[PDB]
């Protein structure tokens, strides 16, 4: 029926086979799932607040704007082209 949600990727599904409760172990940390047009989708960051700042590799910063049921939609406060999946 419904299309694939952002958390429905094989690397995330394979991690729940190892440790069912893999997430919520580090509520302050997440993984980049997709990158496009200045918007970054992340899996995790269970305790991010609406409007809080997110730190990425290379001193790049973003802001959390979409706290969805399965992922966080963040916008980059600078250049996004250097960010990547994983």
């Amino acid at each position: 029926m419904q299309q694939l949600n952002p958390s429905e990727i094989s690397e995330i599904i394979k991690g729940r086979i190892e440790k069912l409760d893999v997430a919520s172990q580090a509520r302050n940390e997440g993984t980049i799932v997709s990158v496009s047009d200045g918007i970054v989708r992340i899996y995790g960051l269970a305790d991010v607040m609406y409007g809080e700042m997110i730190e990425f590799p290379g001193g790049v910063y973003g802001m959390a704007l979409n706290l969805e049921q399965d992922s966080v939609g963040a916008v980059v406060l600078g250049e996004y082209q250097g960010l990547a999946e994983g």
Binding site: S34, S36, D37, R41, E85
Partner: peptide, 11 residues
Amino acid sequence: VQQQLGDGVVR
């Protein structure tokens, strides 16, 4: 590559 769609796929 315009976008990284996730799960190893790029658009």
